[PDB]
Design an enzyme around this catalytic site. Structure first.
Site, PDB file in Angstrom:
ATOM      1  N   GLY A 114       3.973  27.920   9.527  1.00 42.25           N
ATOM      2  CA  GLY A 114       4.588  29.225   9.518  1.00 42.25           C
ATOM      3  C   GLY A 114       5.865  29.283  10.308  1.00 42.25           C
ATOM      4  O   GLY A 114       6.840  28.608   9.955  1.00 42.25           O
TER       5      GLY A 114
ATOM      6  N   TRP B 104       8.939  31.886  12.345  1.00 44.67           N
ATOM      7  CA  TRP B 104       9.677  33.135  12.129  1.00 44.67           C
ATOM      8  C   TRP B 104      10.179  33.290  10.690  1.00 44.67           C
ATOM      9  O   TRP B 104      10.057  34.362  10.110  1.00 44.67           O
ATOM     10  CB  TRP B 104      10.840  33.228  13.126  1.00 44.67           C
ATOM     11  CG  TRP B 104      11.608  34.525  13.089  1.00 44.67           C
ATOM     12  CD1 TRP B 104      12.900  34.699  12.668  1.00 44.67           C
ATOM     13  CD2 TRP B 104      11.144  35.823  13.501  1.00 44.67           C
ATOM     14  NE1 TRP B 104      13.265  36.022  12.787  1.00 44.67           N
ATOM     15  CE2 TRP B 104      12.208  36.734  13.293  1.00 44.67           C
ATOM     16  CE3 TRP B 104       9.933  36.306  14.019  1.00 44.67           C
ATOM     17  CZ2 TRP B 104      12.096  38.102  13.589  1.00 44.67           C
ATOM     18  CZ3 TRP B 104       9.819  37.665  14.311  1.00 44.67           C
ATOM     19  CH2 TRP B 104      10.898  38.548  14.096  1.00 44.67           C
TER      20      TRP B 104
ATOM     21  N   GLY C  92       0.805  -1.217   0.000  1.00 44.43           N
ATOM     22  CA  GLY C  92       0.000   0.000   0.000  1.00 44.43           C
ATOM     23  C   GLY C  92       0.838   1.266   0.000  1.00 44.43           C
ATOM     24  O   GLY C  92       2.054   1.232  -0.183  1.00 44.43           O
ATOM     25  N   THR C  93       0.160   2.385   0.203  1.00 45.34           N
ATOM     26  CA  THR C  93       0.789   3.687   0.309  1.00 45.34           C
ATOM     27  C   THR C  93       0.807   4.019   1.788  1.00 45.34           C
ATOM     28  O   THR C  93      -0.244   4.099   2.410  1.00 45.34           O
ATOM     29  CB  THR C  93      -0.020   4.735  -0.470  1.00 45.34           C
ATOM     30  OG1 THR C  93      -0.021   4.379  -1.856  1.00 45.34           O
ATOM     31  CG2 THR C  93       0.573   6.120  -0.310  1.00 45.34           C
TER      32      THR C  93
ATOM     33  N   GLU D 231       4.036  35.295  12.205  1.00 45.52           N
ATOM     34  CA  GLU D 231       4.882  36.235  12.942  1.00 45.52           C
ATOM     35  C   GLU D 231       5.338  37.375  12.018  1.00 45.52           C
ATOM     36  O   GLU D 231       6.350  37.232  11.330  1.00 45.52           O
ATOM     37  CB  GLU D 231       6.079  35.491  13.519  1.00 45.52           C
ATOM     38  CG  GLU D 231       5.671  34.325  14.391  1.00 45.52           C
ATOM     39  CD  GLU D 231       6.834  33.559  14.967  1.00 45.52           C
ATOM     40  OE1 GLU D 231       6.615  32.397  15.335  1.00 45.52           O
ATOM     41  OE2 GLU D 231       7.948  34.079  15.102  1.00 45.52           O
ATOM     42  N   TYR D 232       4.624  38.495  11.937  1.00 49.40           N
ATOM     43  CA  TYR D 232       3.400  38.837  12.681  1.00 49.40           C
ATOM     44  C   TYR D 232       2.506  39.684  11.801  1.00 49.40           C
ATOM     45  O   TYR D 232       3.021  40.418  10.956  1.00 49.40           O
ATOM     46  CB  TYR D 232       3.745  39.698  13.898  1.00 49.40           C
ATOM     47  CG  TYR D 232       4.465  38.931  14.932  1.00 49.40           C
ATOM     48  CD1 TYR D 232       3.796  37.965  15.656  1.00 49.40           C
ATOM     49  CD2 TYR D 232       5.818  39.138  15.179  1.00 49.40           C
ATOM     50  CE1 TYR D 232       4.446  37.212  16.592  1.00 49.40           C
ATOM     51  CE2 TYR D 232       6.485  38.389  16.132  1.00 49.40           C
ATOM     52  CZ  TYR D 232       5.787  37.429  16.835  1.00 49.40           C
ATOM     53  OH  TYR D 232       6.414  36.675  17.778  1.00 49.40           O
TER      54      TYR D 232
HETATM   55 ZN   LIG Z   1       8.546  31.507  16.080  1.00 43.30          ZN
END
Ligand SMILES: [Zn+2]
Ligand SMILES: [Zn+2]
Ligand SMILES: [Zn+2]
Ligand SMILES: [Zn+2]
Ligand SMILES: [Zn+2]
Ligand SMILES: [Zn+2]
Ligand SMILES: [Zn+2]
EC number: 3.2.1.14
Length: 389
Positions: free
Chosen positions: A95, A97, A68-69, A137-138
């Site tokens: 996300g 910095w 399978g995968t 951020e941010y």
């Molecule tokens: Zn951070």
């Protein structure tokens, strides 16, 4: 939810030089693992920043001959952790910095927001995770701040629709990492964040470092009026502003550092200094498990409520949290009705009695026992779909 959060960031790059794998987590101390980070494109597309770390690396019992995968990497390892620790939830963090430059674009149109939500939720459900953490951020202005709320509402909506089809009755979590500096948090739609999110993880650290003109406490609770250069920021002013701005206290999770920031060639806290010097893995930053260093003694600013190692011979000062600091911060957060503790990041903690995360667990007492999810019937990975059975 039914107790305090005691959450920790687990970084996918920690599997390399740091050699900290998901099986190395002391999972009995942790309510939430925040798996960090996914990258983001300008059109809202969430993507893996490291497919090897995320789902390709074979560990010792990962077969080269499965049908399978199948998902391996940290995804399978974390699913094992979830099976063995039913009160531990794993969140997909997007996300950070370095990879926040595309958030404004990603949140800027209905199409982009829909693409963000769908792509993020696709990873979450394929990987067998319990929610999504957004670390932008941010937000820089009112447009971005408003668009952040629109983005979170889209993700919340799509999560609820996903659960109605493929995990009925399960509440997928939606969280953020949030700024402790007023220059940043004054731009946020605080009341909206309070309404839409499960948790706001307050980044109550990085107050002082190579970016500061003098040595400062990195994560102190209070201002020190008799030595204010030592306290360029303080957590207490941020916490009160978040609550009074409309974030319910019980949704605020107080971030705490498992690292120190070093200051070279200095007399003490609040004072002049030359450089930040070396680090454990990056300049100026030291793993808590390396601290205090040989020949250094820990001092305490009892007004600011912040510790620092000092070495009288080398003139190195390192601002870092100790087990006693954690006890004090837990007393503080409980006194304001906050939701628990959060830590950046797992690989740097000590084991045993001096574990900051374990110290927090014991000081908090009753941790959140809300059950995680193990049913992912729409995962593209057969092993995750079958719950590793
Ligand atoms: Zn951070
Ligand atoms: Zn290396
Ligand atoms: Zn393989
Ligand atoms: Zn719900
Ligand atoms: Zn909720
Ligand atoms: Zn780092
Ligand atoms: Zn316990």
């Amino acid at each position: 939810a039914n107790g305090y959060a005691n959450s920790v960031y687990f970084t996918n790059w920690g599997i390399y030089d740091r050699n900290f794998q998901p099986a190395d987590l002391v999972a009995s101390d942790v309510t939430h693992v925040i798996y960090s980070f996914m990258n983001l494109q300008a059109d809202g597309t969430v993507i893996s920043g490291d497919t090897y770390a995320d789902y390709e690396k074979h560990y010792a019992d990962d077969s080269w001959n499965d049908v399978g995968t199948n998902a391996y990497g940290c995804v399978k390892q974390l699913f094992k952790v979830k099976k063995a620790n039913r009160g531990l939830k794993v969140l997909l963090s997007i996300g950070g910095w370095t990879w926040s430059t595309n958030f404004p674009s990603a949140a800027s149109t209905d199409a982009n927001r829909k693409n963000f939500a769908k792509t993020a939720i696709t990873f979450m459900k394929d990987w067998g995770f319990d929610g999504i953490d957004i670390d932008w951020e941010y937000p820089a202005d009112a447009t971005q701040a408003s668009n952040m709320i629109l983005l979170l509402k889209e993700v919340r909506s799509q999560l609820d629709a996903y659960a109605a089809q493929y995990a009925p009755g399960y509440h997928f979590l939606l969280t953020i990492a949030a700024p402790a500096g007023k220059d940043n948090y004054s731009k946020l739609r605080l009341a909206d964040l309070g309404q839409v999110l499960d948790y706001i993880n307050l980044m109550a650290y990085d107050y002082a470092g190579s970016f500061s003109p003098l040595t400062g406490h990195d994560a102190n609770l209070f201002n020190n009026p008799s030595n204010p250069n030592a306290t360029p920021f303080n957590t207490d002013s941020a916490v009160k502003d978040y609550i009074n701005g409309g974030v319910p206290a019980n949704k605020i999770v107080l971030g705490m550092p498992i690292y120190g920031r070093s200051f070279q060639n200095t007399a003490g806290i609040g004072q002049t200094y030359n450089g930040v010097g070396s680090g454990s893995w990056e300049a100026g930053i030291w793993d808590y498990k390396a601290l205090p260093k040989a020949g250094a003694t820990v001092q305490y600013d009892s007004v600011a409520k912040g510790y620092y190692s000092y070495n009288s011979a080398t003139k190195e000062l390192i601002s870092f949290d100790t087990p006693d600091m954690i006890n004090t911060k837990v007393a503080y957060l409980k006194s304001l009705g906050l939701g628990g503790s959060m830590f950046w990041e797992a690989s740097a903690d000590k084991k045993g009695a001096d574990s900051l995360i374990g110290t927090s667990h014991r000081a908090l007492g009753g941790l959140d026992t809300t059950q995680n999810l193990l049913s992912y019937p729409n995962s593209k990975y057969d092993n995750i779909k079958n719950g590793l059975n």
